């Protein structure tokens with residue numbers, strides 16, 4: 606319900622990173638979730654106020 | 655805690671639809687939840703575009719989607735059909751019209767000039 | 772009128788009218804109410 | 819509620835989902851990844867009963883969830899399915915995490931190509 610039929614803000618509930626979307630797959634006696642996440646990269650430092 | 659003492663964004667945790675509110679009732683050895691939800695109805699289809707070009711610049715909505723009724727384009731909010739004219743106070747500018755795929759030409763109206771005649 | 776047997780159906784079939792420049796937006800809404808029931812306790816027994 | 823189907827063209831602004839959608843050239847109609855997933859896993863009064871739902875029927879629930887999401891996002895879980903172009907669906911999803919929506923629209927090809935390799 607919360608990872609496939611919507612977008613969750615729950616941390617680590619729908620994969621590692623910032624949740625974008627998920628796709629289900631069927632497995633024998635189980636379910637597999639393909640978690641699509643947003644991960645930032647290549648930071649620079651700045652002065653702030 | 656999460657359905658009665660607040661508003662939840664968890665899907666299907668507080669009923670079917672968009673959670674508005676819930677009321678508890680007592681049952682013998684149990685609890686009954688009356689879930690109040692928001693359900694949209696009666697959709698219409700429209701043509702859309704991600705951005706609008708004006709003066710060679712790309713305009714993106716602050717909130718909402720661009721729709722076309724067949725002859726004119728409007729900005730609407732995403733959850734209820736309520737069109738308004740596309741202005742410089744409704745949108746923001748970012749980038750040029752060379753990177754957005756599917757951008758369309760339209761007029762974005764500036765309120766300043768017709769006040770200054 | 773006869774115990775018939777069949778292969779259950781999973782539900783009404785429906786195609787979404789997808790295109791690359793079409794959107795569907797609601798113009799009205801309803802307020803729905805639904806129930807959910809949860810047990811909280813049993814009888815306390817002692818032998 | 820309903821069993822959704824994708825349109826014949828199967829081209830969603832680039833994003834390529836062929837590894838998770840069913841393969842029409844198979845008796846089972848599983849996806850390429852589902853075929854891998856099922857390839858890894860009577861006595862003295864004892865018996866094993868069959869499940870009520872066959873695995874074909876489960877595959878039909880999964881393809882309906884996939885077809886609903888790729889074409890209407892999350893709207894079909896709260897009411898009627900409302901179509902919106904997929905590229906615009908992705909842009910709303912970046913907005914939900916606090917990223918401004920032009921990041922997708924100006925970089926649509928990059929995100930779609932990087933996704934396709936990552937999957």
Ligand SMILES: *[C@@H]1O[C@H](CO)[C@@H](O[C@@H]2O[C@H](CO)[C@@H](O)[C@H](O)[C@H]2NC(C)=O)[C@H](O)[C@H]1NC(C)=O
Pocket residue numbers: 723724725726
């Ligand atoms: C789309 O909506 C517009 C606005 O309602 C319609 O255009 C006309 O716009 C002028 C102002 O520029 C109004 O005075 C007219 O009353 C509008 N006509 C109508 C019928 O509303 C336009 O007709 C609509 N397009 C379609 C295809 O329905």
Ligand SMILES: *[C@@H]1O[C@H](CO)[C@@H](O[C@@H]2O[C@H](CO)[C@@H](O)[C@H](O)[C@H]2NC(C)=O)[C@H](O)[C@H]1NC(C)=O
Pocket residue numbers: 707758759
């Ligand atoms: C949207 O409007 C712009 C600006 O008028 C159009 O850009 C022109 O495109 C034509 C070719 O179609 C060129 O000959 C002109 O030099 C362009 N003008 C400028 C100022 O660069 C653009 O083509 C329009 N888009 C559509 C789909 O009609």
Ligand SMILES: *[C@@H]1O[C@H](CO)[C@@H](O[C@@H]2O[C@H](CO)[C@@H](O)[C@H](O)[C@H]2NC(C)=O)[C@H](O)[C@H]1NC(C)=O
Pocket residue numbers: 798799800
């Ligand atoms: C939205 O839906 C409601 C019905 O659920 C509409 O309200 C009804 O409108 C008709 C006339 O069209 C009246 O005869 C009914 O008495 C109304 N019902 C109620 C409960 O008031 C409403 O008009 C719809 N809105 C639009 C824009 O179509």
Ligand SMILES: *[C@@H]1O[C@H](CO)[C@@H](O[C@@H]2O[C@H](CO)[C@@H](O)[C@H](O)[C@H]2NC(C)=O)[C@H](O)[C@H]1NC(C)=O
Pocket residue numbers: 829834835836837
């Ligand atoms: C989606 O990705 C698949 C691969 O996962 C593409 O199918 C392969 O395409 C290459 C050429 O690019 C062929 O050499 C392979 O034989 C293809 N594999 C199969 C199983 O046919 C597919 O073309 C991609 N779809 C789109 C629209 O780009």
Ligand SMILES: *[C@@H]1O[C@H](CO)[C@@H](O)[C@H](O)[C@H]1NC(C)=O
Pocket residue numbers: 648649650
């Ligand atoms: C930012 O500066 C700190 C030292 O103040 C340094 O350790 C860090 O690596 C720098 N970050 C980047 C991306 O250069």
Ligand SMILES: *[C@@H]1O[C@H](CO)[C@@H](O)[C@H](O)[C@H]1NC(C)=O
Pocket residue numbers: 697698699788
């Ligand atoms: C929108 O158009 C599609 C065909 O492109 C059609 O199947 C669908 O029923 C239409 N929606 C409405 C509310 O008319």
Ligand SMILES: *[C@@H]1O[C@H](CO)[C@@H](O)[C@H](O)[C@H]1NC(C)=O
Pocket residue numbers: 756791792
């Ligand atoms: C949508 O696809 C049609 C072909 O089915 C094509 O003619 C049209 O240009 C496409 N629209 C966009 C915005 O790419």
